[PDB]
Amino acid sequence: DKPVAHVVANPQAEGQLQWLNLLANGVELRDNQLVVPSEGLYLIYSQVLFKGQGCPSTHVLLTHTISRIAVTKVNLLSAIKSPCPWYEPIYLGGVFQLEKGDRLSAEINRPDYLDFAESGQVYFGIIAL
Amino acid sequence: DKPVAHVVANPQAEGQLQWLNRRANALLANGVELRDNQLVVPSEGLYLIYSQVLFKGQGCPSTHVLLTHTISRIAVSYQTKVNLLSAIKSPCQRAKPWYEPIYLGGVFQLEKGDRLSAEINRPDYLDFAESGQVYFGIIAL
Amino acid sequence: DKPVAHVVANPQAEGQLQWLNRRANALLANGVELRDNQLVVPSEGLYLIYSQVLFKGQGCPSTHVLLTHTISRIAVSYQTKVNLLSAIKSPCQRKPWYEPIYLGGVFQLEKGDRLSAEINRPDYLDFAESGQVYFGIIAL
Amino acid sequence: DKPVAHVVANPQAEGQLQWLNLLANGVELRDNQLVVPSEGLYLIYSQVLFKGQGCPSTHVLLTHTISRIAVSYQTKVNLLSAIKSPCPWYEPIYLGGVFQLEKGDRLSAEINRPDYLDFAESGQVYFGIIAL
Ligand SMILES: Cc1cc2occ(CN(C)CCN(C)Cc3cn(-c4cccc(C(F)(F)F)c4)c4ccccc34)c(=O)c2cc1C
Numbered sequence: 001d002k003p004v005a006h007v008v009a010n011p012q013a014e015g016q017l018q019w020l021n022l023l024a025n026g027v028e029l030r031d032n033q034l035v036v037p038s039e040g041l042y043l044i045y046s047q048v049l050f051k052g053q054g055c056p057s058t059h060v061l062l063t064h065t066i067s068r069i070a071v072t073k074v075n076l077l078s079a080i081k082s083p084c085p086w087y088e089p090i091y092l093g094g095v096f097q098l099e100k101g102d103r104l105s106a107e108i109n110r111p112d113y114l115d116f117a118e119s120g121q122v123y124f125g126i127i128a129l
Numbered sequence: 130d131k132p133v134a135h136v137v138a139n140p141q142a143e144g145q146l147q148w149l150n151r152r153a154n155a156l157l158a159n160g161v162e163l164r165d166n167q168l169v170v171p172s173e174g175l176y177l178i179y180s181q182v183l184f185k186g187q188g189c190p191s192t193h194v195l196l197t198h199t200i201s202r203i204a205v206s207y208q209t210k211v212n213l214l215s216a217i218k219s220p221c222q223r224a225k226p227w228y229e230p231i232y233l234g235g236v237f238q239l240e241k242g243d244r245l246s247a248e249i250n251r252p253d254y255l256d257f258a259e260s261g262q263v264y265f266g267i268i269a270l
Numbered sequence: 271d272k273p274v275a276h277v278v279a280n281p282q283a284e285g286q287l288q289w290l291n292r293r294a295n296a297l298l299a300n301g302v303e304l305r306d307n308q309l310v311v312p313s314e315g316l317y318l319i320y321s322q323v324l325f326k327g328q329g330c331p332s333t334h335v336l337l338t339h340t341i342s343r344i345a346v347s348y349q350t351k352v353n354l355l356s357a358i359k360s361p362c363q364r365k366p367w368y369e370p371i372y373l374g375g376v377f378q379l380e381k382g383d384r385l386s387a388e389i390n391r392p393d394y395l396d397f398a399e400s401g402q403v404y405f406g407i408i409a410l
Numbered sequence: 411d412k413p414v415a416h417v418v419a420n421p422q423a424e425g426q427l428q429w430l431n432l433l434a435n436g437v438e439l440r441d442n443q444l445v446v447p448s449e450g451l452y453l454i455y456s457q458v459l460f461k462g463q464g465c466p467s468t469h470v471l472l473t474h475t476i477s478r479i480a481v482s483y484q485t486k487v488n489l490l491s492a493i494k495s496p497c498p499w500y501e502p503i504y505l506g507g508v509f510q511l512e513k514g515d516r517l518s519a520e521i522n523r524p525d526y527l528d529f530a531e532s533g534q535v536y537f538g539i540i541a542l
């Protein structure tokens with residue numbers, strides 16, 4: 001009965017990383033954000049896949065970050081890659097103490113580079129400890 | 130009441146990778162302590178241990194840049210520093226900025242009082258400009 | 271793609287813990303070998319390693335019975351035997367007793383590493399039925 | 411896309427360990443058994459919790475085993491087994507390993523003493539597979 005979530009990205013969304021409604025024991029998906037049903041320790045994780053065709057002239061940075069909106073806002077986890085056909089994953093994860101009704105966003109800078117070749121390989125989840 | 134920790138690099142500590150718990154969304158719970166820049170395990174057990182360090186440089190002056198990241202254990206009973214996890218990266222094969230995140234994770238039998246270090250060789254390439262980019266944590270299983 | 275193994279004790283080997291792949295439902299796939307009673311890793315990587323041993327005795331003649339189970343790694347460039355996982359049990363504090371010992375963890379391994387899973391008391395080993403003593407790895 | 415299952419025991423079954431109907435990507439539960447939808451390497455795991463009050467004169471042995479029913483090869487063997495001798499006591503038994511399975515193979519997770527099952531914690535008696 002411990003809160004758990006695992007949302008996957010909508011491949012058919014336009015210029016957005018958008019999460020599709022596992023969402024169990026009180027975790028909600030609202031406003032593209034995971035809402036935590038109770039205070040406690042949560043493992044938070046995500047994976048986004050990026051792909052591109054060759055290397056252009058403007059230098060490509062790929063960013064991915066998980067943020068906590070404490071209903072204050074702050075970056076929990078963030079990573080950046082500089083890919084310059086190329087393929088890059090960015091993973092994030094850790095344990096955090098969260099408050100009831102906190103909201104969690106997992107965001108990127110370049111939705112156009114998203115790689116939906118493998119289904120459900122772009123995800124975001126939490127598991128309460 | 131599982132021991133758990135998640136510490137983050139100190140963005141005011143130049144030329145060092147210094148871990149902090151006293152930040153919003155860094156964590157020491159249920160007995161894990163941070164002392165002398167090391168996580169101290171409060172009780173014997175199985176622990177998932179993980180880290181991410183973000184390296185960044187401006188251009189490649191040399192092909193010989195080598196970035197290392199390691200997590201090691203020091204046991205009270207066997208004062209030797211023993212590596213648990215390590216990775217090495219060569220970011221420069223040949224002036225725009227390169228980024229190289231290094232991730233370490235594994236599941237280890239740890240003893241009461243073990244000290245866990247997470248270290249790098251090049252704190253001048255460390256990127257803690259934004260929060261969330263350099264971290265080190267453990268979860269008792 | 272990933273290297274994987276799951277080996278089981280030889281019920282015909284008395285006084286030892288001898289692993290087998292050549293049984294129905296034991297496995298060596300994608301490069302893992304079993305040689306000199308050890309699993310040999312085919313490539314550098316992160317590996318979940320696990321074992322279960324079932325010990326069984328008939329009564330407690332002594333409170334000093336001690337059961338150990340360990341998994342060790344021998345690296346080509348190191349040659350020192352280094353413990354990855356270990357447990358100890360004292361079954362007799364004072365009829366058959368049973369003590370399953372479970373080991374599990376996730377380790378960085380190199381090409382050619384040799385993994386050993388051993389016990390101190392093969393006379394207490396219970397491989398009467400299948401599935402009771404096993405040792406495996408899964409590349410992650 | 412990879413087959414996965416995790417079924418939990420029915421706390422209201424009589425004199426039996428009975429799995430309730432995730433169950434995705436082709437895994438089925440049929441005749442109290444998980445059925446594999448494709449050939450491949452599977453992680454198989456389970457946990458059963460037993461509990462009892464004090465220790466009697468009859469010696470309590472608790473067994474738990476996972477079996478592979480190979481349908482076309484027509485044979486049936488234990489994949490994983492363990493035994494505990496508990497003699498208010500509490501005992502878990504875990505099982506797990508990686509196995510190569512064939513399409514339509516059926517998997518059972520069985521015990522010897524359903525009367526000792528401990529349903530005190532709801533989501534703690536379970537049986538699952540994860541295709542690699
Ligand atoms: C902190 C961290 C350490 C890590 O260390 C090792 C690996 C390599 N692997 C375990 C297999 C390759 N992967 C991509 C798997 C993976 C591993 N983790 C992971 C591993 C350990 C600890 C955590 C955390 F959530 F607890 F912080 C996550 C993932 C989280 C999200 C998506 C994928 C993963 C990682 O991928 C990794 C990822 C992260 C985020």
Ligand SMILES: Cc1cc2occ(CN(C)CCN(C)Cc3cn(-c4cccc(C(F)(F)F)c4)c4ccccc34)c(=O)c2cc1C
Pocket residue numbers: 175270319320321322372373374375453454455456457504505506507508
């Ligand atoms: C082979 C084996 C090794 C093991 O080594 C370590 C532990 C100790 N722990 C991780 C404490 C937490 N547990 C009891 C949970 C647990 C750990 N495993 C587990 C761990 C490693 C490998 C596997 C396997 F599925 F790959 F075989 C299972 C479970 C399988 C089913 C139900 C529960 C578990 C185990 O419980 C364990 C269980 C098993 C079955």
